[PDB]
Amino acid sequence: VQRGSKVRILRPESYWFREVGSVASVDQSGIKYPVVVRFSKVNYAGVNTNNFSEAELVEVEAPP
Amino acid sequence: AWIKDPLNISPIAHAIWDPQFGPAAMDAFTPAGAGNPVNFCYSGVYHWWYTIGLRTNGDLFAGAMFLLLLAAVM
Amino acid sequence: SYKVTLVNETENLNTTIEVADDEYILDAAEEQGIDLPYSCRAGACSTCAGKLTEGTVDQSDQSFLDDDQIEAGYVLTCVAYPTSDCTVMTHQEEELY
Amino acid sequence: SHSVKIYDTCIGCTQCVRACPTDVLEMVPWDGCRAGQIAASPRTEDCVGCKRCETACPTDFLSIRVYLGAETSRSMGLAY
Amino acid sequence: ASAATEQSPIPTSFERWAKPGHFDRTLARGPKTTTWIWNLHADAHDFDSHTNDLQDISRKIFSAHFGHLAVVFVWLSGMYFHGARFSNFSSWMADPTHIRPSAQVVWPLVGQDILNGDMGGGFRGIQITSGLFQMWRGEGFTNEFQLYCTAIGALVMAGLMIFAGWFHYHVRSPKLEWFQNVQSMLNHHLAGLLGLGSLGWAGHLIHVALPTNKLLDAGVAPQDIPLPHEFVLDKALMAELYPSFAQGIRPFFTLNWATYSDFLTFNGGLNPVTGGLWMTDIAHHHVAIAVLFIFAGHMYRTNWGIGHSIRTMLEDARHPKMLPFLSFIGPVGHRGLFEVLTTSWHAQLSINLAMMGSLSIIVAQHMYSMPPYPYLATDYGTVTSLFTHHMWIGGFLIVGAAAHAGIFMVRDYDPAENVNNVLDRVLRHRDAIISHLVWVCQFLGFHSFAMYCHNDTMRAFGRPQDMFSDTGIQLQPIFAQWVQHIQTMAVGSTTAPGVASPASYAFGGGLVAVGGKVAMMPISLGTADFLIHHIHAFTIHVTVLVLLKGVLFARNSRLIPDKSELGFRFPCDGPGRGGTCQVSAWDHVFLGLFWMYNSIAMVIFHFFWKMQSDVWGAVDANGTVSHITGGNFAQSSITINGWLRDFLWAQATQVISSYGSALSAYGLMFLAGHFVFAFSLMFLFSGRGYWQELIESIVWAHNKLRITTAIQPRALSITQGRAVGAAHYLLGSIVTTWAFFLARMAAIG
Amino acid sequence: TTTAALYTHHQYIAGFLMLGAFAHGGIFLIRDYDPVANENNVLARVLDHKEAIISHLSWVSLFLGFHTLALYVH
Amino acid sequence: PCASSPAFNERMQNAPEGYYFDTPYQSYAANLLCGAEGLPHQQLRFDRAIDVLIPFGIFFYVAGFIGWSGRAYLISSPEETEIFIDVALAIKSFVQGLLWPLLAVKELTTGELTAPVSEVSVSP
Amino acid sequence: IGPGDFLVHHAIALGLHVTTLILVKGALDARGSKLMPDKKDFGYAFPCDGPGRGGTCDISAWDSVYLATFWMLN
Amino acid sequence: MKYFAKYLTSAPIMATVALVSLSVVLIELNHFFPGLQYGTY
Numbered sequence A: 001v002q003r004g005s006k007v008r009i010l011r012p013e014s015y016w017f018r019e020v021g022s023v024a025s026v027d028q029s030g031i032k033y034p035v036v037v038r039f040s041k042v043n044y045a046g047v048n049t050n051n052f053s054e055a056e057l058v059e060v061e062a063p064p
Numbered sequence B: 001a002w003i004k005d006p007l008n009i010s011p012i013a014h015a016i017w018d019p020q021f022g023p024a025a026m027d028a029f030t031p032a033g034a035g036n037p038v039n040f041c042y043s044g045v046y047h048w049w050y051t052i053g054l055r056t057n058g059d060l061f062a063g064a065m066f067l068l069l070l071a072a073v074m
Numbered sequence C: 001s002y003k004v005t006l007v008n009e010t011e012n013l014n015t016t017i018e019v020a021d022d023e024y025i026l027d028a029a030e031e032q033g034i035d036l037p038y039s040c041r042a043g044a045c046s047t048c049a050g051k052l053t054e055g056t057v058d059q060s061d062q063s064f065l066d067d068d069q070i071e072a073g074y075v076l077t078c079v080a081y082p083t084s085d086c087t088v089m090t091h092q093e094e095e096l097y
Numbered sequence D: 001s002h003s004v005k006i007y008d009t010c011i012g013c014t015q016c017v018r019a020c021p022t023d024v025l026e027m028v029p030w031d032g033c034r035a036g037q038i039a040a041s042p043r044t045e046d047c048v049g050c051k052r053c054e055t056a057c058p059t060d061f062l063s064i065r066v067y068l069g070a071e072t073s074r075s076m077g078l079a080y
Numbered sequence E: 001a002s003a004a005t006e007q008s009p010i011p012t013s014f015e016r017w018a019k020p021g022h023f024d025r026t027l028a029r030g031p032k033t034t035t036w037i038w039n040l041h042a043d044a045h046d047f048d049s050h051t052n053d054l055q056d057i058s059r060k061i062f063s064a065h066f067g068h069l070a071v072v073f074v075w076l077s078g079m080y081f082h083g084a085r086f087s088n089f090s091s092w093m094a095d096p097t098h099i100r101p102s103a104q105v106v107w108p109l110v111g112q113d114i115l116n117g118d119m120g121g122g123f124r125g126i127q128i129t130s131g132l133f134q135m136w137r138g139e140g141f142t143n144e145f146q147l148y149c150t151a152i153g154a155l156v157m158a159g160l161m162i163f164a165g166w167f168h169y170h171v172r173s174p175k176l177e178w179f180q181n182v183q184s185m186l187n188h189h190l191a192g193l194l195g196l197g198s199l200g201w202a203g204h205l206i207h208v209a210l211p212t213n214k215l216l217d218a219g220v221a222p223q224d225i226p227l228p229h230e231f232v233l234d235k236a237l238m239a240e241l242y243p244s245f246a247q248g249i250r251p252f253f254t255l256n257w258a259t260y261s262d263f264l265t266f267n268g269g270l271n272p273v274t275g276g277l278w279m280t281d282i283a284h285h286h287v288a289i290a291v292l293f294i295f296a297g298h299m300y301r302t303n304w305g306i307g308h309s310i311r312t313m314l315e316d317a318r319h320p321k322m323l324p325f326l327s328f329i330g331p332v333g334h335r336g337l338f339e340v341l342t343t344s345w346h347a348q349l350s351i352n353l354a355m356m357g358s359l360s361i362i363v364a365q366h367m368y369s370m371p372p373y374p375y376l377a378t379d380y381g382t383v384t385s386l387f388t389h390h391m392w393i394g395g396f397l398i399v400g401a402a403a404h405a406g407i408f409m410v411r412d413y414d415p416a417e418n419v420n421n422v423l424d425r426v427l428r429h430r431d432a433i434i435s436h437l438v439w440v441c442q443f444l445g446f447h448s449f450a451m452y453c454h455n456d457t458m459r460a461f462g463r464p465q466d467m468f469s470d471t472g473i474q475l476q477p478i479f480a481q482w483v484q485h486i487q488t489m490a491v492g493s494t495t496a497p498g499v500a501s502p503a504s505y506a507f508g509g510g511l512v513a514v515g516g517k518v519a520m521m522p523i524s525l526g527t528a529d530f531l532i533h534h535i536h537a538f539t540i541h542v543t544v545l546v547l548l549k550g551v552l553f554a555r556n557s558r559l560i561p562d563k564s565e566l567g568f569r570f571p572c573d574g575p576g577r578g579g580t581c582q583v584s585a586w587d588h589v590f591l592g593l594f595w596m597y598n599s600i601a602m603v604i605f606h607f608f609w610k611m612q613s614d615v616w617g618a619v620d621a622n623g624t625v626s627h628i629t630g631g632n633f634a635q636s637s638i639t640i641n642g643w644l645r646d647f648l649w650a651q652a653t654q655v656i657s658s659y660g661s662a663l664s665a666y667g668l669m670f671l672a673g674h675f676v677f678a679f680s681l682m683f684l685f686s687g688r689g690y691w692q693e694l695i696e697s698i699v700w701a702h703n704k705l706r707i708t709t710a711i712q713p714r715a716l717s718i719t720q721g722r723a724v725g726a727a728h729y730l731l732g733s734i735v736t737t738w739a740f741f742l743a744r745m746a747a748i749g
Numbered sequence F: 001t002t003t004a005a006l007y008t009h010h011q012y013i014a015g016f017l018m019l020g021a022f023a024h025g026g027i028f029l030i031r032d033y034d035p036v037a038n039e040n041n042v043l044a045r046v047l048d049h050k051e052a053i054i055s056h057l058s059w060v061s062l063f064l065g066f067h068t069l070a071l072y073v074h
Numbered sequence G: 001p002c003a004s005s006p007a008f009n010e011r012m013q014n015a016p017e018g019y020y021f022d023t024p025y026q027s028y029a030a031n032l033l034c035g036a037e038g039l040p041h042q043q044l045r046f047d048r049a050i051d052v053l054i055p056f057g058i059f060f061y062v063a064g065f066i067g068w069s070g071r072a073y074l075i076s077s078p079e080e081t082e083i084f085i086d087v088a089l090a091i092k093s094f095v096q097g098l099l100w101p102l103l104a105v106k107e108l109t110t111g112e113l114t115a116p117v118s119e120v121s122v123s124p
Numbered sequence H: 001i002g003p004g005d006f007l008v009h010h011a012i013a014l015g016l017h018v019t020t021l022i023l024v025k026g027a028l029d030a031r032g033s034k035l036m037p038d039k040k041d042f043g044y045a046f047p048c049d050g051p052g053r054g055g056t057c058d059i060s061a062w063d064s065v066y067l068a069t070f071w072m073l074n
Numbered sequence I: 001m002k003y004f005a006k007y008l009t010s011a012p013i014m015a016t017v018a019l020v021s022l023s024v025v026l027i028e029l030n031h032f033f034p035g036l037q038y039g040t041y
């Protein structure tokens, strides 16, 4: 997973569970949730992006 | 009094003892065959007790005392 | 093609970096060897508040700045859209509150 | 008192701390996110339960949860 | 140019129409969810949020006022056109006692022309209850061409009003110094709007209305009457009617005013022919109040030294310059209130809405008892509709007054501006105000309604000697009975020797009956009237409690000390502190809308039943009055059961038995109002999270069919669900009463 | 009156009992439901597709309501 | 039948004529089924099979037209086309929406009318 | 039974279906939904989850039995 | 008048024209037999 890859969310408590969002930037600082995923569909609080781990993402489109 | 004519007699639930009634309400809640204000029973227990054998007030009192003692047993 | 100049008193320097129309300044700043404060990258905090000295940015996705606070020049550099270039202040979260 | 729990999806944006009307929350060093901060709730005996901290949280789902618990005279917000 | 105060920008652009939300910064973001759609119409007119300059807001308000005046002129044009094309006005002009006013015909579509009822004279239409015919008869109209001319004039005025609003914003808009000239505005409105307006209407009455009405009452047919300009043109024709017009305008300048005492009468009763007030007495009224209002308009210093300055009068009303018992308002008094009222539009709107609603209620209470138009009091549907309509308008306006008193608090109130003055000192003891209002509401609720419950229990027990009746424990309103006696003694041939009749026959005096039916007669006040007036006092007081509580605690309270930071319209502050649901001032306007409903509904019910059982009826040849429900207010309106049986169950005979008749639309609207009332309770009892979680399943079912939409479907917000529930409750519950009143009065007269 | 009262009595008791059935079905899923003891069985299988059940109850409700109300209003 | 119904003629020969009872009481009485109250009752039999098809089946076409015009307009979209209805794409989804009956069976077999279980958001 | 029976049976069908909708929705969303994923940690009866996320009034499973009592009564 | 056409394509304007255009069946329910039962067409 790196910038541009479309990913499906595997987090049950996420608003975008089983939804495809684009990776914005991956942090190489060794933090727990480094991947920033951005969504075309906003959540209830008014937020369209979130930090996920790599273990709760499934790549569905390699970046072109 | 109701088992003699269960079509033209209204079953009675119990008696009224509201001291706040005027005599116009004491008269209104007193039927033809009663000497006190009463409530007309609409629970159907008269029909049920008449269909299962109960014929007298002594039968009803015996059943009530049995159920009092059965509640004590429970 | 746009040119954004980030000014920071701490670093005491004005480095310019071109940013694409459809691209966040902070996101474009990461792909140009430049460090900036950022926490949520969603427009729901004030960690990347950059006062606008001149120019105009497209921050329609931002959802935290106040009407009177956005008139001062503050603009979340995390969910901002570089329309041109001009210049913008960095690390201005202490001036917000 | 209410229970205010902070989870490791916290990003140290401080917005929960700034939104608290009763000063329950503060920031502590973490090195578990790149801000280096995480919220904490020591003065949770002061918590009224307004959940302004939860409204201020940007993470999905919330990195801060308030569980309304035993009511005291402080959590009921009583000046009498 | 003439006062050097305009030069406004905001060029008339068209592109700015295909970008909704252009006024708000977050509204012009990009929709995203559905809450944006509802947010578009939730603060569309709130010009205070849009910008920050007071001058731009004032300019916008001025042009919005002009556009509103244009809308009202379009409505007036429509009413005059309906009276000039789809009405039986001429037929009613011929016989206004046997013909039913009608100004609306229904097209012959599906089952639909049954609503066209026979109105007398072969006219198949809908019986209007707006009082337009009775108003046009009193103004001086005789034929429909004059109504058509008035309609065209009102349409021209509407076009002129939408040009004045575009010219005073897009071409030459005023400066803020012009809007802040409250001295000049008060002078002109008091002398030029009210004073000259009533003077011009007195001129109209003296030269058009009084002639036409005098000939109409004499017996002349409506098209046998001369047109108004002949009354104006030749003085011989006008001197036949009045012998004081032979001396022209000479006795006025030489101060011989009793010469004019035959068209400026001071009778003070009702015309026996029509039933309305004495037309000469009306003209004399308008002359006197023109002289009073014009004289009142020379009070405030404008550009010439003489006058008052309202700022000086406000700043001097303070201790130790007050009456000694009124000296509790301290040494600042009303010092910062001239700057409150000349810089806050919401403060002005709050005062003006309170006065406008109160004055609409005063209009309602003065036009049933002193019927001011010919053949008005005998058309009971019109009397009912006018009283009821003006009570509802007054109540809504009064609720909006509290709404804007709360918007002033959260937004326009400045603590540093007004320190230790009356506004600061009210906010500084509001616990005393609110707790004493709580106690008086409780005292009034026990001593009005629980007495009705006492009466129900005593009547069901069969002990009516124990009741609060006129035959049981009497509760005579001795003070109002004494005022009624003073009013009928005053008018003797005393304390008002000039008047012949009582100011209304409602106080005392005699009986005016017109066309067999009663125009007006004394309204006796007994124990039932005591009880229902205390119901009115109780309901008005709880409405005041609900509304004033939100105004006084709009800034902060003991619960939430920073409520002004949360806004004026916010749902809550979470489930903490026990749960702070509906703490905003807006939620108090929400809860006071219900209490204004409950207050005005009982007022209109009291009016309907009391007037229908103790005034309205049918006088026979001898003089005996057979009232409509038969004088059953004095014994049935003292229990709740008699209100449900002898008023609601009995008088709704005409609205539910209306199917198949011409009043069937009223039965349909009666059921429709019940539907909308019940449908409101879905929004009022339920909460937002249920509906958002059910929309989740519906969105899942949509995603599975690939019928997903970009605008994300969200449940109505908390305060929006409250607003929707309140609007539906009010609409259905008022449409129900409207259908009940109008079907009843269109069937039994 | 006895017949009417008895029918209405038992139908309201039955509606309340049916309301409490679903109340304690919810309280079970809150308090006692074990997602691992009930792994991929019928109960956990109806919890999985619960949006289909809720949307189809919603469709039946909407169809019935629109048609019945519109027929009555016509 | 309504023609031979003895109670249906007391609303025949005593009613307003107009143009809502004169050109409607006929065709109705010729081809309806009344009971005992003189009221047409909508029956569901073999004679109604070619009678109830024109309310039932012809409503299904227009309802599916609306539902497929609302679909084909909304797959080709992005939050400004719901506010400001793009009349060109609306006409494009109306022209295809006319013969939506065929297109609907050309989606179920191809598997592009239903979405996968893992490509649709769910809840805990 | 006649035509007036068909409509009221469809009204009874509507009523049972909407009451079942409310109760089934609140039982199946008792453990959590998309608006409140961890709803099982807050219990069966709890007021709300505050005014965040648009507002969460009547979000608990107890509030479904609350909202369906009106529909059962109707 | 560039965005005057766009404002006439807005949701409320399309809504009002759609309701009046589908609801103009006044002329369809008056032209032939203003009462049309299920079994009569």
Ligand code: CLA
Binding pocket: B015, B016, B017, B018, B019, B020, B025, B029, B039, E456, E457, E458, E460, E461
């Ligand atoms: C001020 C008004 C008032 C008051 C105080 C009363 C008082 C009384 N009435 Mg009366 N009534 C009234 C108005 C009033 N009435 C009117 C206006 C009428 C019309 C004329 C009547 C007609 C009437 C009739 C026909 C009867 C009465 C009776 C009674 C007595 C019943 C209480 C009792 O003795 O046993 C004590 C029991 C209680 C106080 C129980 C109530 C307390 C709890 C809260 C309810 C029960 C618990 C629980 C919640 C309910 C069970 C579960 C439930 C969910 C099913 C009582 C003295 C009855 C009687 O005479 O009894 C011998 C009788 O049959 N009244």
Ligand code: CLA
Binding pocket: E437, E438, E439, E441, E442, E443, E444, E445, E446, E449, E450, E453, E542, E545, E546, E591, E594, E595
């Ligand atoms: C019939 C229904 C009903 C009743 C009885 C009430 C009663 C009350 N409302 Mg209320 N309200 C209602 C409907 C009702 N409301 C609805 C439908 C709404 C929807 C918007 C509201 C919204 C509302 C608001 C916003 C407010 C109230 C307030 C009040 C209180 C007013 C003070 C008072 O009257 O003292 C007298 C008490 C009564 C009239 C209650 C009945 C008392 C009976 C007649 C006597 C009982 C005898 C004896 C004590 C019984 C003892 C028996 C023993 C066994 C217990 C009062 C308790 C206001 C308040 O708090 O005032 C201070 C307040 O601000 N209401």
Ligand SMILES: CC1=C(C/C=C(\C)CCC[C@H](C)CCC[C@H](C)CCCC(C)C)C(=O)c2ccccc2C1=O
Binding pocket: E682, E683, E684, E686, E687, E688, E691, E692, E714, E715, E716, E717, E718, E720, E721, E722, I015
């Ligand atoms: C029913 C209900 C809802 C649901 C109501 C909603 C979502 C609004 C219903 C309006 C519908 C969805 C109309 C919108 C449809 C489109 C505009 C399309 C209409 C078609 C025309 C263009 C012809 C709430 O959100 C709510 C919130 C808080 C308290 C109580 C309640 C409440 O009772």
Ligand code: SF4
Binding pocket: D006, D009, D010, D011, D012, D013, D014, D015, D016, D017, D038, D039, D053, D056, D057, D058, D059, D063, D064
């Ligand atoms: S608001 Fe949320 S993400 Fe930000 S510091 Fe507080 S708990 Fe962490």
Ligand code: SF4
Binding pocket: E571, E572, E573, E574, E575, E576, E579, E580, E581, E582, E687, E718, H047, H048, H049, H050, H051, H055, H056, H057, H058
């Ligand atoms: S129930 Fe609703 S209004 Fe009340 S505190 Fe909770 S979110 Fe706020």
Ligand code: FES
Binding pocket: C037, C038, C039, C040, C041, C042, C043, C044, C045, C046, C047, C048, C076, C077, C078, C079, D013
């Ligand atoms: S990094 Fe949080 S809003 Fe910018």
Ligand SMILES: [Cl-]
Binding pocket: E459, E636, E639, E641, E642
């Ligand atoms: Cl009674």
